[PDB]
Design a binder for these strands. Sequence first.
DNA 1: CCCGGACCTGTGACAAATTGCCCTCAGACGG
DNA 2: GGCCGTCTGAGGGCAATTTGTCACAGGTCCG
Length: 210
Amino acid sequence: SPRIVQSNDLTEAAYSLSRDQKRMLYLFVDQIRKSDGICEIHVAKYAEIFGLTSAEASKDIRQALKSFAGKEVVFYYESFPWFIKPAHSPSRGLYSVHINPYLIPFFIGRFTQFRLSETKEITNPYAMRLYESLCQYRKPDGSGIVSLKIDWIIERYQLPQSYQRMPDFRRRFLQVCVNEINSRTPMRLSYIEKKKGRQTTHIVFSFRDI
DNA sequence: CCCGGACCTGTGACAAATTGCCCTCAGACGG
DNA sequence: GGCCGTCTGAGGGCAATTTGTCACAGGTCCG
Ligand SMILES: [Mg+2]
Ligand SMILES: [Mg+2]
Ligand SMILES: [Mg+2]
Ligand SMILES: [Mg+2]
């Protein structure tokens, strides 16, 4: 199945995208790398890749696409729009998109790589972001260990404001996304909290391959 | 001493958003 | 040649679940 690779600058960029948007983004990065910024998506191919009906695929592509307008990307800083022209459909079942050509060098560069089947069952987009960031540190054999700072997680992934209260961070983000990864990818994940005084400052992740 | 206060934790509630499902009907194609 | 039966996909919706938000109970230490 398709092998996604991407610059670490993208893995660690600041942005807010939905699951459906992130799914399309993997294919854009795949199309671009296999070579101006103009990409294409076929309804019927998307449905087969992610096990959807054509109808629900159509709904997913269409709504995702109009929600890109005005979205911006920050590399730590510098801000860019993803798209510089609205999407449009020349043929039935076919969509054409114009990626910001200044983003090309950030896609292809100190890199991250994973097969697309590893992530296609994840639902929560924050769990996608987390699985990408861990892959950046994985070893050939399939294991790794890394410490991420809590303020940096909040900025980079653009978590919502109430997760600045630590019990909500644990309950609605950390625990859920560790569960999905353990339930939906071939990885087995554990963690421990690093504290300084009363505040929790980093999260330390360990993982192996099944 | 023990207070009110400033931190921290977890949980119960509710509001807002997203999920996989369902139904309709016209477009593009073929037998 | 052209009608109609089928495969697509662009729309309209849903209830059951998940995600986002905040009040309140209940721990500690400070001055
Ligand atoms: Mg959908
Ligand atoms: Mg008393
Ligand atoms: Mg009690
Ligand atoms: Mg008290």
